[PDB]
Paper text:
Transcription of eukaryotic protein encoding genes is initiated by the recruitment of general transcription factors together with RNA polymerase II to gene promoters to form the transcription preinitiation complex (PIC). In vitro PIC assembly begins with the recognition of a specific TATAA promoter sequence by the TATA-box Binding Protein (TBP) which is part of the [name] complex along with 13 conserved TBP-associated factors (Tafs). A striking feature of [name]’s structural organization is that nine Tafs contain a stretch of amino acids with sequence homology to histones, including the histone fold (HF) domain involved in histone dimerization. Here we describe the cryo-EM structure of the yeast [name] (formerly known as Pichia pastoris) [name] complex at a resolution of 4.5 to 10.7 Å.
To further stabilize [name] and reach higher resolution, the complex was incubated with TFIIA and the 105 bp TATA-box containing [name] glyceraldehyde-3-phosphate dehydrogenase promoter (pGAP). Single particle cryo-EM analysis of the promoter-bound complex combined with local map refinement showed a significant resolution improvement for the two lobes interacting with DNA while the third one remained poorly resolved. The compact tri lobed KpTFIID architecture is stabilized by a topologically closed (Taf5-Taf6)2 tetramer. An atomic model of [name] residues 36 to 1194, including the 4-subdomain arrangement of the aminopeptidase domain (D1-D4) could be fitted into the cryo-EM map. The linker between the [name] lobe and the Twin lobe is built from two copies of Taf6 HEAT repeats (residues 213–486), thus confirming that Taf6 is present twice in holo-[name]. The WD40 domain forms the core of the Twin lobe and coordinates the arrangement of the three HF domain heterodimers. The cryo-EM structure of yeast [name] rules out the possibility that Taf4, Taf6, Taf9 and Taf12 form a histone octamer-like arrangement but revealed instead a hexameric arrangement. A continuous thread of density suitable to accommodate a double stranded DNA molecule is located between the [name]- and the Twin lobes only in the promoter-bound complex. The promoter DNA contacts [name] through two arginine and lysine rich loops of the D3 domain of the aminopeptidase domain (residues 733–742 and 646–652).
Residue numbers in the entry:
A (entry chain D): 218 to 258, 260 to 305, 307 to 436, 449 to 485
B (entry chain A): 36 to 93, 162 to 273, 331 to 381, 395 to 597, 605 to 666, 686 to 736, 785 to 898, 930 to 999, ...
Write the structure that this text describes.
Amino acid sequence: SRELQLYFDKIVEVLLNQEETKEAELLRNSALQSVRADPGLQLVPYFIQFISETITKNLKNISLLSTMLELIYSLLMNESLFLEPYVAIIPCILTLLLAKKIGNVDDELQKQQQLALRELSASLLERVIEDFGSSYSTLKPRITRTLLRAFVSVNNTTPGTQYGALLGLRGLGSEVIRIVVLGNVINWSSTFLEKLQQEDQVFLIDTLIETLRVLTKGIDNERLKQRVGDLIADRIQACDDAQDIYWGIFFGEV
Amino acid sequence: AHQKVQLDVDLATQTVNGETELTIFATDPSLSKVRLDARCMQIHEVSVNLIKANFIAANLTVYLPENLRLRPHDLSNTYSPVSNYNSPLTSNSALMNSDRLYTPFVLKINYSLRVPKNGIIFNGGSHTTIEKTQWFCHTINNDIGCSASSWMPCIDNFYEKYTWELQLIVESPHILDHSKKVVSVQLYNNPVAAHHIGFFVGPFEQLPASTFKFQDQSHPKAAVAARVYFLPSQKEMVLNTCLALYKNLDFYSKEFGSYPFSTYSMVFVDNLPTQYSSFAGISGISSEVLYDSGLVEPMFPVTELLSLIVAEQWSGINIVPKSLNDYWCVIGIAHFMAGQFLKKLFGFNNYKFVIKQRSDRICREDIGKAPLANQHFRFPVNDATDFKFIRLKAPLVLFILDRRMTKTDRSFGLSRVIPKIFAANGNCLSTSHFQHVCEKVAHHKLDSFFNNWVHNSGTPVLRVTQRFNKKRMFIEMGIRQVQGYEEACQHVDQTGPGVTSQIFTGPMTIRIHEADGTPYEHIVDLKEGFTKLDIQYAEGEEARTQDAAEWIRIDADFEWICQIHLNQPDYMYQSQLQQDRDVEAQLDSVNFFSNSLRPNVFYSSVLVRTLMDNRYFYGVRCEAAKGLARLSKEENNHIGLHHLLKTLKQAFQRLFIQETIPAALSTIKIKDSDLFLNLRRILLRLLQYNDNLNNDFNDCFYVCSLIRALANTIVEAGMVLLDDRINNINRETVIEFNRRLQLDAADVSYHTCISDTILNEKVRLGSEGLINFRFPELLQFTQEKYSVYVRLAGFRGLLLLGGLKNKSILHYFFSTAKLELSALFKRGLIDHFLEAVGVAALXXXXXXXXXXXXXXXXXXXXXXXXXXXXXXXXXXXXXXXXXXXXX
């Protein structure tokens, strides 16, 4: 038992952790499919510890993050009974959703790999947070408090990682979407005004506002809009004077 | 008398060039055109006195002192002396001709040793050896043999003793020429010969130690730098070998005489192992050369090897006899010292029982040998003679000579005789003179015992007579001995059964036992063979003959190698094996009872109790287990009480469980054949469940015993070869062996179980195997070079297993053997190739004739031309003798 486990762990580290070219993609896909199709959960502790240590002490380039995310997604999506008792979506999902130096220092502007990796991390973390029946995913208060504290403290990983992780976890866990999307009253103007910091990324701000409005725009919304019209005066006239919130919601709903 | 050798430029290029300033003493010798021994080297000048002169190259023959240009005043003059020095000359020292004797000179000449010098492993450090140690070469050159000619140009005789200095650069040295250290070594007092003048260029790290010890690693069971020496390693091995070698060296030095050495440290060179070099221990000049066996199974192997090496080095270099036929004397002294030291240090398997087993094995292996006093000459002959039957035959002669009378004459005679030769006859010793002095100072005769004992011996008939005298209480008895018998003269040019190999009968001890098997002794002179003597003052057989007089059992030294034969076999074997205060008597009685006949339940219970007794050791337990295994039925097949008893009893371990598991495993799974369900369940359950009750670190014994048991069960029970899942059991065993070998040799590391498992599987299979993957698998493994211990095993196994077709097998094997030249691959490939070919190809005359016939039928492809045209040094001599014997 102690020999086969060490042999497989070392074979994956040398492999998996290594690198190639022509046989790199075939080796990674074959290893992920084999580990997520046969074998057993005996190498779940070693793989989780090594992946957590390398992901916690690495955060360089975009290739390592993509490979680790793909391996964790394949093993977690085709694993045995060990992910739920070990609980890894909290630290893994937390670090993946809080990362920013990997993309910034590694392709800051136009971080396509950072956006794709953020979406994949939101899907995996969303499924992990949704795979709970009794208390297998009670990290909602900690995640909400962490996001609110981070947004009210600074602009760490701004702006898309926290929104994608929270949106994915809330959407996948909504078995709470109304309370998660509401939270407080005037939050858009208070968040943008509280942050801002002379955001020179007009396309990034507009893209984030449009994404939030589209994600927030539906049975209740369709019934209310069809029975009235999205409340042009109420939303306008009433409510607050959010130019980006009202403009984005009206433009996305028109 | 002196010598100044200057060698350098040996590393990197794997060469060794330097000048040589030889200082003669010799006094007489021959001088002028001296025949200096040399090999495939390059000469470099040869000045002498003034300029040079004519001289032959080539057996070297460099002329010196021929004309009258020199002066004779130095040799004719004489200086003053004291203490009666004399030092007179004569016509030889003066006269007026060439080849004068008793003359002094000083010669000099530069020599160059290229990388094509046979008889010396050369591996420079520059992309030619390996990634390990790039700034250090490895040109270890042997010394015990004829390497002096290849290492330099000088004489290589044994009848001329002279001293020499060792001042090489690789007293005390440091800075001399930039990055060179002038190592000066006087040694101009004591003198040696020419056969022990080598240059083993090995590692510089010396892992020596001392001798003070008491515990350290939980021990145990005026000095010198003992221990060993490796390439920055061998910590535990150097510690254990340093403590054991320190204690043994201290005991031998305090119980022998003297020793002019202070570097009692071995070494683990990369060129190991070798036939007559890295075998066990090498004797050079205050330094041992051992092979890479630090993690192997030691115990009696490493103990007997170290003891025999120390005793041989202390008794093979202290006395320089004029005759090379002192193999029995040196081997006898070394065996006596090693036996006393081992008996006083090691004591687990009974020293007496071990000596008895060694004597029995020596007799069985010597029942069909040749003669001891061979015809002397040159490393294969020395290695074969030192590791043949002389070591096992010297112990019997030494014990018989030392036991023929009193031990005081032997101990005092040897100790006092060693000082005479070691004080005043360093090069004048003679085995005949020593034996004559010993026989003349301690009793006499010994001629018939020495010559007759070294010629041959045998016996196979012993008659006893019983006579009851009630008129005066005279229990007469008779003892008679009879036999039924039906290169050394070029492998015995004629013949001859003896006819009487054992001349004198020696002592005839009569240990007669009283009623119920007592312990009465008797000293019978006998002497003359075929004589008589006289003595005096379900269990129906034992009940009717419980006690009648005295059951005189068999003996007390075995003068004629000895089988027992007399009445009362069951009573004598039972009473001797169950009532005897002697380990030898108990072992002999157990062997005789196991080889004869007796009861079933009684013999099984008594054998189990005796084998399970705490007083019994590995010899008693192994003997009882062997007897019960060979006789597990009075007339049936298996014994449920013996098998169930051994299995139940078998279910720090130590020697008990280690020796019981191997004997019960190799002896349990024997024939069987039938009952593939129970047999496959027991053998498969033991193999797959091995070490399933006490698995720890000691896995060598379980690996060897397990491999032997599996090979014996699959071979004996699978020789014929499914009504009982026979095919399923065979396929399961083959798949298990393949997976185990691939797992232990792939994602693992081993070397003390892979060879035994592969050899056991191949030997157990053999016929009815895969036709044919042995050549592709062995060729792939050897070509890939997986593990240091795997290539030689695969090549030897394939060469010793193949035979059919043989299409291109000779060319492939020849190219592989000629290309894979190193240490284990070269030695193991040559020895394993010759032995494998001879064993695979083939009473003695018939076998030789058959082999010759086969060779004649398949004379195609030899070389001979190529093999012999490539064989050099050791391969040249061994290949020359073997080739000449095969031609």
